[PDB]
Design a protein around this nucleic acid. Sequence first.
RNA 1: CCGGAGGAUCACCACGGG
RNA 2: CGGAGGAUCACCACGG
RNA 3: CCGGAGGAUCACCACGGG
Lengths: 129, 129, 129, 129, 129, 129
Amino acid sequence: ASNFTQFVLVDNGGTGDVTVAPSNFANGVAEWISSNSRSQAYKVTCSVRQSSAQNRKYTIKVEVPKVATQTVGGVELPVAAWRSYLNMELTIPIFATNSDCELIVKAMQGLLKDGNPIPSAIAANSGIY
Amino acid sequence: ASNFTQFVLVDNGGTGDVTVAPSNFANGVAEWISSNSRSQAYKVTCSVRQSSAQNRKYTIKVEVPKVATQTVGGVELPVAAWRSYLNMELTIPIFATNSDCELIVKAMQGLLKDGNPIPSAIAANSGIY
Amino acid sequence: ASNFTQFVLVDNGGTGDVTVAPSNFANGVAEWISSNSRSQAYKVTCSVRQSSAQNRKYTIKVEVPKVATQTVGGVELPVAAWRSYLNMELTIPIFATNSDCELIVKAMQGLLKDGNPIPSAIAANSGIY
Amino acid sequence: ASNFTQFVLVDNGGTGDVTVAPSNFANGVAEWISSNSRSQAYKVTCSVRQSSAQNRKYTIKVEVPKVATQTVGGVELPVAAWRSYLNMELTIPIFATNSDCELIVKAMQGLLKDGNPIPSAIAANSGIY
Amino acid sequence: ASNFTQFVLVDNGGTGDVTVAPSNFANGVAEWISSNSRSQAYKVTCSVRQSSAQNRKYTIKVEVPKVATQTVGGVELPVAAWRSYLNMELTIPIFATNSDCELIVKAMQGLLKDGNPIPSAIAANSGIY
Amino acid sequence: ASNFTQFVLVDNGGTGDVTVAPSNFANGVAEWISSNSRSQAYKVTCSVRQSSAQNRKYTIKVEVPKVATQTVGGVELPVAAWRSYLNMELTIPIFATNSDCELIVKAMQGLLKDGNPIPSAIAANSGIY
RNA sequence: CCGGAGGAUCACCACGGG
RNA sequence: CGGAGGAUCACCACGG
RNA sequence: CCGGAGGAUCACCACGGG
């Protein structure tokens, strides 16, 4: 294998797709970013470590730029107003087999499938009701 | 409408599908659980709060159990050999429009699409390289 | 270029081949792990540092597990009955040229070549006689 | 039968082959030394012992010299400019069968096989990258 | 892709070219070295960190050795009579787009083009006047 | 000689070239700047001194303006968002001959030649991977 | 962490600060 | 930095 | 409240801060 390759982060159906590509591997922490200024880029980082004796832990982070009214290549301040941050931590007991892990991934995909509660809420600036 | 509905967490092609349903909303934390004993259930929780004056934070949690039957005191009980814990936090600026938020959702979906780096590494008990 | 890639640790024909893949590279310590339950995985770690003014020191570690299923309370877990631990340290003065190093490597390969004293002894639960 | 015999430590074609021969076996420590001036000789030592109730421990050592002529006062002596030192320890539980041990050996051979990460790094005065 | 590749540091027209290759990435510091003994090697290191909340800093280092053969204790060893050290730090705002960064690279290349002031002064052991 | 002359800092192939010209020589520190407001200019300074008994040290500094979305002749704040800073320090032992120094310059040109790792990384808002 | 036309035997050191 | 020092193995007690 | 490629038996815990 060798999974450190570019991929489509935002699939807008061929036209308007956002692709992130390998941009750093310092300290075993893999990083991908879109072709933008670092302040307006889509960033993705991932790393895995043995957090405890019984667990392994994947730490995934994603940064998504606010696009509405954005000025490409411009200086947009304050930073906190123009960016969303996603921080995921996946803890997997050392007993998990590859199959177990496939299931875990399926569960994550299901959680965010289109039309499901969580994604629908987020996409509508809403909570649960 | 009302987005607090049941959904398929683990899609196994209609056969062996794991479905979670609304089970609690006490204290502003929306909860879903699979049709199991509380000790062997899949669990999904979600809550959103206005973290800062200009940010909103979604806190999502998923628990994937490895079901087993343990014999305690000569008696068989339904338990979980272990659990995998997904803990994710998403911070979105209040200036994010609905289109801005859909972007975030699409990015998260892309991050975990089958074949992409992260899900591949996870499912193979490996890091990124 | 990158030498932090996956490789065959055990060449059992072309079938039961044990392969280890990059898992983590934190704090100057590269680590490879075979697939499936981390609890039954093979582990290889390597690191190099300047031990002294004139010496560079490599520290390699290998773990060979004895795969087994542990049952307790009627609950089975994939585990390692026990593990064989290999800990080696190689010291090379900074005056060593690439050729000097190639030699050192050949010496290591020769020391463990099939049929030679040391490998033969180990493979037979024996010492020197 | 005897495995305390001479062997080829360095396979440089079929010419500049470095061979080490039994020199001493005092106090459970077998020692091989290449021919000619002991001052410029290659050294290999090996010993095994019961490190604990369940573990047997092998301790192998190898010395690779950089041959050189030292001149002082107009007096030349065959010496070693410096030496590369390999010190390795292998721990094997007493439950290991001969097959288990053969595996351990294959793992060691694989770790140093030509082309693999660790050997490549060493042979090139490099670390992992 | 992967930009961690070997390259020609000193172009001497194909004859007497100094080439450096990836040799280490431990601790987030990418290192390249020439095919020499560690004591006589050319060395290039590079690291990038997010210095401030809005800046990124590249730290590049180059070591140019004056190779020599020193006789220590009547023995000849490959050493460096002395070394020239280049230490450069580049701070780029996160708002810099790719085009903005190409500008920086072009400026640095221009700064050192043959015939220009700075390189002329340096190569002549003189200041600017 | 007399190297304190104007030169092309950014070569964009005849059209769109950035030229910096002598603008100050206070304290032996030579300075060049482009035809812009000091806040948006390309600035270059260079000075050389005997840093220690065995070394001479050239200190070169370069400031490059962020051009994307720039408003020519306008007031752009904060300054740190619109400028990149390069600080180079070259230490050369007093034994270095002119030839030695020519080599040092070649090494610097090589380090930044188009297509090489460092320039490629910088130009792509990336690290090494 | 930040600064110096601060030093180095060069991924280190001292100083100065908040 | 040392040990044919121990380990459940990037840890541990001792000696400097 | 905020931060950590901090930990968890997982809506909890410790630490670090203002």
